[PDB]
Automatic annotation (TrEMBL), chain A:
Classification of source organism: Viruses, Riboviria, Orthornavirae, Negarnaviricota, Polyploviricotina
Protein's UniProt name: Hemagglutinin HA1 chain
Disulfide partners: 42-274, 55-67, 90-135, 278-302
Glycosylation sites: 11, 23, 286
Residues spanning the signal sequence: none
Amino acid sequence: DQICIGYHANNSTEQVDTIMEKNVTVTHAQDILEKTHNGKLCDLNGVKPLILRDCSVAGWLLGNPMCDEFLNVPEWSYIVEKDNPVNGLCYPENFNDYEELKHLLSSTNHFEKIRIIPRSSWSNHDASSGVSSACPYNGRSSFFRNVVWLIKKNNAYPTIKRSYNNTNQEDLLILWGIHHPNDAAEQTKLYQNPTTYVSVGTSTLNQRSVPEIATRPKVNGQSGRMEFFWTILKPNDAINFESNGNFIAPEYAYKIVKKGGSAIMKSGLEYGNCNTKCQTPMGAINSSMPFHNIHPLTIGECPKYVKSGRLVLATGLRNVP
Amino acid sequence: GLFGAIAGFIEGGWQGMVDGWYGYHHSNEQGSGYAADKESTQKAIDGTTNKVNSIIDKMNTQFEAVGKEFNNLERRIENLNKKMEDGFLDVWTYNAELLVLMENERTLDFHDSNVKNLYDKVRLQLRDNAKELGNGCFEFYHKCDNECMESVKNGTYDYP
Ligand SMILES: *[C@@H]1O[C@H](CO)[C@@H](O[C@@H]2O[C@H](CO)[C@@H](O)[C@H](O)[C@H]2NC(C)=O)[C@H](O)[C@H]1NC(C)=O
Ligand SMILES: *[C@@H]1O[C@H](CO)[C@@H](O[C@@H]2O[C@H](CO)[C@@H](O)[C@H](O)[C@H]2NC(C)=O)[C@H](O)[C@H]1NC(C)=O
Ligand SMILES: *[C@@H]1O[C@H](CO)[C@@H](O)[C@H](O)[C@H]1NC(C)=O
Ligand SMILES: *[C@@H]1O[C@H](CO)[C@@H](O)[C@H](O)[C@H]1NC(C)=O
Ligand SMILES: *[C@@H]1O[C@H](CO)[C@@H](O)[C@H](O)[C@H]1NC(C)=O
């Protein structure tokens, strides 16, 4: 008659690693690494992202005519931009502190567009002829819709003096620019006055820009360039613009809503008509696992990212036949 | 294993004991059978469950990368950013893999120790009333039945 002490065994094929030995088969184990995603860009907790498609942030904010899909975008969860969107600065040029503006976006969930300076407000300047073949629309010369390329009128460009007070509760993002002509002859034809500038002042901003009239290689058929600027006008503060030429004036600006908590994700995917609580640039994640190895740049409530290809914890004992 | 029981002085496991991780297999007149020891098994279960939970919870403050962009004349800070994010990713990946490797080893030895301690507990019981075969089994001198067997497992077994 006997009594024996023993331990469990099963047909488990599960394996774990240890410092002294790899691939130890055990009776029970727990995988703690999520390795799958749904290959789509989804709404984050019911809120759809802003998918910029073929438009860059600049093409959207300035109003490139090829970007009308984004003239009045609604609240978003996250923003998706492609690596190299084709529609950005249709008239070639530079956008000052562009990456800082993109970073600012990443902490907001909504830009509500408002008209701070009516285009009909330019009585002594031509507010219609400022168009270019570089920014076509419906087969004709057009221009960024949110700003105005002012041109001389009746062979004169009287000095502009405009002020705008932010009577809203939200910070206001204001964009404007200056045109750098290809030569003196062009300076005269568009603006009449030969020596010009664009000065801008707020309680904190102090700036005076001068056109650098030169000849460069054609980009989108233009050898001239536009240079854009931006500032944040605080509630109750005012912005003062003065220029006797080359001014690309604001028409529309954006009220900023910091419901805060966004991200600018780089991806070529389009909207997948799905909903998730965790999004990556490669697809969404839906899991209880504590870790994932999909991609490091995620948004929402996600597992912890690691580069591991495998992460399995032993729970049971060594499985001995 | 560190405690020498599993795949040790008790050469193999029992496919026939599906009631738990550790247990007994008796043999007398009435018959034989396997019976998992619910006390040590559950004690093991609570231990492992807490371990899994602790590991997860300790891995809740890991680093989280954030997207930023840099222009053509900001390559040094762009690289600083990149090295820093990759840097933390590598640190946390290392922490996760190592913690799992180390605890897996401890988990295996933990089961080994539970078996060894269950065996020793029994050995102490069957003081001089049974013969230690040295294979994890005890052969009684004077016959022992189902009531007697149940006495050992009952932890009640004692001539008293
Ligand atoms: C923007 O306009 C507002 C509203 O008119 C100005 O603020 C008010 O100014 C008056 C006159 O000094 C004060 O008595 C009020 O108390 C102000 N109201 C507020 C909301 O503070 C403001 O000065 C203008 N901003 C600038 C920089 O000119
Ligand atoms: C469980 O422990 C008890 C002692 O607490 C053992 O003693 C027998 O218990 C049963 C009830 O399960 C009684 O009917 C018997 O009369 C007890 N022994 C005698 C003959 O006095 C019991 O053997 C242990 N295991 C079981 C359930 O048999
Ligand atoms: C035995 O192993 C097979 C393959 O994993 C499994 O499907 C089956 O359920 C196991 N037997 C048991 C315990 O049911
Ligand atoms: C561990 O087992 C897996 C089985 O898929 C095998 O691919 C791997 O090479 C093994 N590693 C070792 C220690 O050889
Ligand atoms: C994740 O999967 C579970 C199981 O089907 C489901 O209940 C839950 O709704 C899913 N969550 C999302 C947002 O996909």
